[PDB]
Design an enzyme around this catalytic site. Structure first.
Site, PDB file in Angstrom:
ATOM      1  N   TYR A   1       0.838  -1.187   0.000  1.00 52.38           N
ATOM      2  CA  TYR A   1       0.000   0.000   0.000  1.00 52.38           C
ATOM      3  C   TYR A   1       0.876   1.241   0.000  1.00 52.38           C
ATOM      4  CZ  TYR A   1       1.133  -0.397   4.959  1.00 52.38           C
ATOM      5  OH  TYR A   1       1.797  -0.530   6.156  1.00 52.38           O
TER       6      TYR A   1
ATOM      7  N   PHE B   1      -5.728   5.259   1.804  1.00 48.49           N
ATOM      8  CA  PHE B   1      -4.818   4.145   1.538  1.00 48.49           C
ATOM      9  C   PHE B   1      -5.131   3.552   0.170  1.00 48.49           C
ATOM     10  CE2 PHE B   1      -2.186   3.269   5.210  1.00 48.49           C
ATOM     11  CZ  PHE B   1      -2.795   3.999   6.211  1.00 48.49           C
TER      12      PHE B   1
ATOM     13  N   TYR C   1      -6.276   5.357  16.688  1.00 54.55           N
ATOM     14  CA  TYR C   1      -5.426   6.535  16.859  1.00 54.55           C
ATOM     15  C   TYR C   1      -5.951   7.718  16.051  1.00 54.55           C
ATOM     16  CZ  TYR C   1      -2.848   4.397  12.825  1.00 54.55           C
ATOM     17  OH  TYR C   1      -2.495   3.803  11.634  1.00 54.55           O
TER      18      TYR C   1
ATOM     19  N   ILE D   1      -5.132  -1.256  11.540  1.00 45.94           N
ATOM     20  CA  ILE D   1      -6.115  -0.222  11.826  1.00 45.94           C
ATOM     21  C   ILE D   1      -7.482  -0.661  11.280  1.00 45.94           C
ATOM     22  CG2 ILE D   1      -5.876   1.235   9.775  1.00 45.94           C
ATOM     23  CD1 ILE D   1      -6.248   2.258  13.295  1.00 45.94           C
TER      24      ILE D   1
ATOM     25  N   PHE E   1       3.383   9.062   3.618  1.00 45.56           N
ATOM     26  CA  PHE E   1       4.191   8.802   4.804  1.00 45.56           C
ATOM     27  C   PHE E   1       4.437   7.327   5.083  1.00 45.56           C
ATOM     28  CE2 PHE E   1       1.279   7.230   8.093  1.00 45.56           C
ATOM     29  CZ  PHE E   1       0.050   7.476   7.516  1.00 45.56           C
ATOM     30  N   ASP E   2       3.487   6.446   4.778  1.00 43.23           N
ATOM     31  CA  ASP E   2       3.615   5.019   5.069  1.00 43.23           C
ATOM     32  C   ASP E   2       3.465   4.289   3.740  1.00 43.23           C
ATOM     33  OD1 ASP E   2       3.487   2.365   5.867  1.00 43.23           O
ATOM     34  OD2 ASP E   2       1.894   2.665   7.334  1.00 43.23           O
TER      35      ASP E   2
END
Lengths: 378, 48, 610, 43, 107
Positions: free
Chosen positions: E26, E99, E82, E56, E36-37
């Site tokens: 992803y 995502f 979160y 998540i 960022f991820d």
């Protein structure tokens, strides 16, 4: 109890420990002379630039400069480091070759003078490279903190100054008079005040501890006892007063007057009077030790060893006090005349006047008596 | 003043007993100003 | 790095030769052992074997066997020629590998020539580079000395414990990791967990030499330097939890921790480690049960602790008045901590160390404010007055309270510790017979300090016996707040140590006042309802520890006791009652029984008819 | 293995090392995971 | 709740069931467009059990709803975990997510 029933790994640990203590430790090897020589060779730099003066320092010179730099840096205390410890040890053992030579029949005058020449060369190899200043800098930097650092520095200084050679004395005097510093002499005073004497309390404690003889984890014999508590740093204080003697050896009147009073500096520390004070303390401690053995018929082996330590240190102190005044320096002669030297001499006379008879009434103490008479001669 | 130093005329000093390991003390609480070997240290002057 | 790998290879090869050589050495020792048991008629050879390969520590045995490197030593050694030559060959190749004995050939020549060439090329001016090249140069030139310095850290372990030591090294890993990090909450918790696991590891106990070689005592001590140099009371609670157990592990570990005794007493404070574990506790644990360390204990540490004890005696505990307890003007709890440390210093193995006792009494007597309001002329009160006011404090909850801390109990526990310390500083019986001047004068000082009438009075005040109260229930006194028989034991220790019992009239007077009531209380609590009562257990151990062991050595004095004969009768009746074992330890009961027999062999049979 | 190759050091770092070393620990970087005192985070 | 929007069609026939560790790669962003991820950049796919919710929760729901071989952008509302007091140093405490995850070789 047989070694076979012990675990294999623990047996290996005992083997490693005893092998380390019995073979490698005794396996001596000389590399200081070779390595100092290799560091002193300048290489090809002069070949590339003959006509250029103020050339780059030799590797040894750069090394000594590095230690001088760490010495002159500003810091609360001089942290111990094995790098300088090892290097100062090496540089001392390079000059000590001619000190030991490498039953005492006569030696040719030619041979004796050539031995002095070899020692002078080996001392030049270091004192033309800043070692004479670096020992002063590190003694001033330690600020009277007793430790292996000041011990190694003092041993190196003795190695350079052996035979009372005048070049190193002149360089040391010029450095002190120019930098005008008081840290060096304050440090010397502090170290001499922290030198120890004959305790007579640690003696009883150590005697009872050795008479105890219990079986610890270390084995039947307690190898973890404090070895010498009665006279610790004896070798340090002998080296300290040896250094102060070698400063004034050869009747160097300038350094003798400098030790008495350092004009030019803001504060003056009378090293001669301070030495007399240490002598007075040692005299009182020896008198107390003699009173401790006054009633006993025969001084035992530990008592003989402790008298040997104290009397050898007193011999070194006496030699340095003599060297402060052997050249006819009226200043130091008057200073010692007005000091508390007379009380120390009277005490020592009493100690010898009774100790001579006390040892002469027995044959097994003849070695202690010979050493005692030697001290009285000094 | 340090231990092992000569004492001069008109010097103040603390006399500690060897028998009782006790100072020479001026006890004035009674009002008679007596002398006793007690632990309140007391200075003394030794005048020839 | 490559030089470090060369050194690591050398030490590993040394360990490999160690394991190869121990098998041969054990085999040769087996053959000589079999020969010794086969023929031991020759007394000289039998004694030589019984000293060399028998009745000696294994370290001494291996040292004597391995001492053959010199030819004169090798002339007479139990090793065979094959094993001998194998070791000589290994030493020769060790020298060859260290280089003991153009174009470079080996790493040593390569680095040496390279570093010298770098220095000759130009005047280097980066100090870190300078010390780098000279450090490498020194290591290359002096190879043997590097091995000499490395072997202290070298250790050899059995393969079966490998996993446990891997967990050991991992735990030590994070201790060193958060050594350099400032202490925080989760950091503290992480290292509490690592200390817990360092407990759990079995190699902690079964290898103390490797404990020293890794030197995690140094690491945790420096962690103390952070926290102490007030903050993180959990950290200060976990200090002794590992340090003190490390002291208990082995005697050498206790020596290692004794080397740092100056620092622990340097910051020794009651505010430090207020609950449970303490720097005070590690200081005392370093001196527990070791005559050699007791003797080596220098006297300026005793100066530190006497000054701190005087500080406690000067003013009441700041923590206590923060809790709101009534202002005493003098701290009992911290004083009693310091007195426990002093007792551990002075007394060891049932013996009094003369020099430690002398300096301790000299310093304590030098600072008269150490003893407290009692035993001082300005205070105008004695030990008796101290115990009366302490019992009144324990009596009234107005001044006992401000919850678990009780002022009266703390006060008389402090005075009990003081008296116990003086009794443990009392000179020995044989010394006082031989007439040592200092021993006689120390006993005289103790005699002047502590008057006898105070002792017999303090023994004469009894306990508070637990009562039934409501039916079906057993209400017990709060020993943590009131007077307990442990104070009595420490009190009578002064009696059996300093004054002694040499008068028969004094003996029967002492048993009449405060001793027979205690044994009657024991007989009264001998019932199974009060057998497991904690006050009864305290009185029970008080009896077996202090009361009847005094009676056994006072047994010859009991001969010819016709006056007050029925008092001796009642005493022996109660001795028989606790001779019957009801909730008694075997050792306690045996003490009671031996006291009974010692009495029976001196009391008159015409008296013993009851 | 060359006959006369003896008395020459083996190259530093090519031998077998047996000294016990705590093995390296790394946690792969994941951030999409539902993040829930806390255990020591790995590198 | 998420807004799952397909990007490129895949199999569309095998959907993850409850109790299977699925492997996904992803590139996660914020609503601004914020990479960022990225497991693609790290070259390491990520595995997640459905039912334990180790991933998540919004990503878990969208991943259950997509199929093997297919990519979808999961617009994750801050109610996914979160979403308040987020993962420190990477995501501010209250923010959204997206995502663009595709599923490959469903286990």
């Amino acid at each position: 109890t047989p070694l076979y029933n012990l675990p294999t790994h623990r047996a290996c640990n005992m083997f490693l420990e005893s092998y380390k203590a019995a073979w490698i430790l005794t396996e001596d090897h000389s590399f200081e002379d070779r390595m100092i020589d290799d560091l002193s060779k300048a290489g090809e730099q002069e070949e590339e630039e003959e006509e250029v003066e103020e050339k780059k320092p030799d590797p040894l010179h750069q090394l000594v400069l590095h230690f001088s730099r760490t010495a002159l840096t500003e810091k609360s205390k001089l942290d111990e480091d094995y790098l300088y410890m090892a290097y100062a040890d090496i540089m001392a053992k390079s000059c000590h070759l001619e000190e030991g030579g490498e039953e005492e029949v006569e030696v040719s005058f030619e041979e004796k003078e050539m031995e002095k020449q070899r020692l002078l060369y080996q001392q030049s190899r270091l004192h033309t490279r800043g070692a004479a200043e670096m020992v002063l800098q590190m003694i001033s930097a330690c600020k009277g903190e007793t430790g292996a650092m000041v011990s190694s520095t003092l041993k190196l200084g003795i190695s350079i100054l052996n035979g009372g050679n005048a070049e190193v004395q002149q360089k040391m005097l010029d450095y002190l008079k120019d930098k005008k510093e008081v840290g060096f002499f304050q440090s010397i005073q502090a170290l001499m005040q922290t030198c120890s004497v004959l305790d007579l309390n640690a003696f009883e404690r150590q005697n009872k501890a050795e008479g105890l003889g219990m079986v610890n984890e270390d084995g039947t014999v307690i190898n973890r006892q404090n070895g010498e508590k009665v006279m610790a740093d004896d070798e340090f204080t002998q080296d300290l007063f040896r250094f102060l003697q070698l400063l004034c050896e050869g009747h160097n009147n300038d350094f003798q007057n400098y030790l008495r009073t350092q004009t030019g500096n803001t504060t003056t520390i009378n090293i001669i009077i301070c030495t007399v004070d240490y002598l007075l303390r040692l005299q009182e401690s020896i008198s107390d030790f003699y009173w401790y053995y006054s009633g006993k018929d025969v001084i035992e082996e530990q008592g003989k060893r402790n008298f040997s330590k104290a009397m050898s240190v007193a011999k070194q102190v006496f030699n340095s006090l003599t060297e402060y005044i052997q050249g006819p320096c009226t200043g130091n002669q008057q200073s010692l005349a007005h000091s508390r030297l007379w009380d120390a001499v009277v005490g020592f006379l009493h100690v010898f006047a009774h100790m001579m008879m006390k040892l002469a009434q027995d044959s097994s103490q003849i070695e202690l008596l010979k050493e005692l008479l030697d001290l009285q001669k000094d | 003043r340090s231990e092992g130093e000569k004492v001069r005329v008109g010097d103040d000093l603390i006399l500690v007993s060897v028998s009782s390991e006790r100072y020479l003390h001026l006890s004035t609480a009674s009002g008679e100003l007596q002398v006793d070997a007690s632990f309140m240290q007391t200075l003394w002057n030794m005048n020839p | 790095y490559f030089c470090d790998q060369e050194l690591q290879h050398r030490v590993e090869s040394l360990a490999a030769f160690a394991e190869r050589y121990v098998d041969k050495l054990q085999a040769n020792q087996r053959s000589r052992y079999a020969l010794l048991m086969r023929a031991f008629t020759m007394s000289a050879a039998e004694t030589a074997r019984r000293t060399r390969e028998f009745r000696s520590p294994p370290q001494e045995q291996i040292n004597m066997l391995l001492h053959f490197k010199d030819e004169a030593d090798e002339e007479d050694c139990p090793l065979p020629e094959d094993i001998r030559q194998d070791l000589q060959d290994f030493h020769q190749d060790l020298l060859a590998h260290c280089g003991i004995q153009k174009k470079p050939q080996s790493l040593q020549e390569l680095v040496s020539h390279m570093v010298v060439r770098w220095a000759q090329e130009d005047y280097v001016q980066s100090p870190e580079l300078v010390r780098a090249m000279f450090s490498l140069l020194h290591r290359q030139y002096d190879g043997l000395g590097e091995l000499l310095r490395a072997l202290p850290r070298a250790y050899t372990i059995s393969p079966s414990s490998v996993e446990d030591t891997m967990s050991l090294l991992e735990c030590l890993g994070q201790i060193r990791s958060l050594l350099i990090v400032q202490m925080g909450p989760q950091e503290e918790n992480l290292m509490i967990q690592s200390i817990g696991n360092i407990m759990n590891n079995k190699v902690f106990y079964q290898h103390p030499n490797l404990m020293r070689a890794l030197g995690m005592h140094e690491t945790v001590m420096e962690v103390m330097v952070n926290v102490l140099g007030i903050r993180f009371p959990k950290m200060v609670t976990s200090c002794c939890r590992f340090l003190c157990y490390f002291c208990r592990i082995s005697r050498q570990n206790q020596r290692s921790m004794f080397d740092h005794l100056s620092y622990l007493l340097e910051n020794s404070g009651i505010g430090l480690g207020m609950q449970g574990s303490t720097p005070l506790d590690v200081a005392a644990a370093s001196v527990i049960d070791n005559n050699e360390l007791a003797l080596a204990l220098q006297e300026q540490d005793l100066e530190k602790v006497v000054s701190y004890l005087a500080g406690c005696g000067l003013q009441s505990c700041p923590m206590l008045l923060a809790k709101g307890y009534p202002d005493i003007g003098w701290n009992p709890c911290g004083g009693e901590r310091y007195l426990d440390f002093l007792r551990f210093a002075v007394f060891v193995n049932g013996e009094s160390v003369e020099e430690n006792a002398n300096v301790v009494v000299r310093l304590l007597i030098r600072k008269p404010e150490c003893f407290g309001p009692a035993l001082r002329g300005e205070g105008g009160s004695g030990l008796l007055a101290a115990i009366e006011e302490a019992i009144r404090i324990s009596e009234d909850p107005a001044r006992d309270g401000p919850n678990r801390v009780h002022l009266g109990h703390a006060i008389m526990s402090f005075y009990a510790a003081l008296i116990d310390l003086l009794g443990r500083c009392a000179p020995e019986m044989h010394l006082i017979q031989a007439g040592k001047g200092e021993a006689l004068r120390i006993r005289a000082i103790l005699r002047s300090l502590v008057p006898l009438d105070d002792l017999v009075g303090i023994i004469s005040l009894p306990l508070q016996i637990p009562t039934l109260g409501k039916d079906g229930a057993l209400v017990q006194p709060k020993m943590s707040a009131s007077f307990v028989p442990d104070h009595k034991a420490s009190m009578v220790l002064f009696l059996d140590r300093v004054y002694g019992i040499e008068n028969q009239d004094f003996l029967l007077h002492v048993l009449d006042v405060g001793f027979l009531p205690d044994m009657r209380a024991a007989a009264s609590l001998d019932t199974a309802t009060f057998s497991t009562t904690e006050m009864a257990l305290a009185l029970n151990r008080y009896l077996c520890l202090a009361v009847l062991p005094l009676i056994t050595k006072c047994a010859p004095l009991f001969a010819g006791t016709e006056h007050r004969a029925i008092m001796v009768d009642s005493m022996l009746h109660t001795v028989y009652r606790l001779s019957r074992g009801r909730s008694l330890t075997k050792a306690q009961r045996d003490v009671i029984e031996d006291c009974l027999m010692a009495l029976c062999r001196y009391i008159r049979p015409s008296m013993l008819q009851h | 293995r060359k006959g006369g190759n003896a008395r020459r050091h083996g190259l530093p770092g090519v031998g077998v090392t047996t000294s016990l070393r705590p093995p390296h620990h790394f946690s792969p970087p994941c951030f999409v995971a539902a993040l829930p005192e806390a255990p020591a985070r790995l590198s | 709740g998420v807004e799952i929007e397909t990007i490129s069609p895949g199999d569309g026939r095998t959907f993850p069931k409850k109790g299977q560790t699925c492997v996904v790669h992803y590139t996660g962003m914020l609503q601004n467009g914020k990479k960022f991820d990225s497991s693609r950049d790290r070259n390491k796919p990520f595995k997640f059990r459905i039912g334990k919710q180790e991933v998540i929760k919004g990503f878990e729901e969208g991943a259950a709803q997509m199929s093997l071989g297919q990519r979808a952008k999961l617009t994750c509302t801050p109610d996914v975990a979160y979403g308040a007091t987020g993962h420190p140093g990477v995501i501010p405490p209250n923010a959204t997510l997206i995502f663009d995850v595709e599923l490959l070789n469903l286990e």
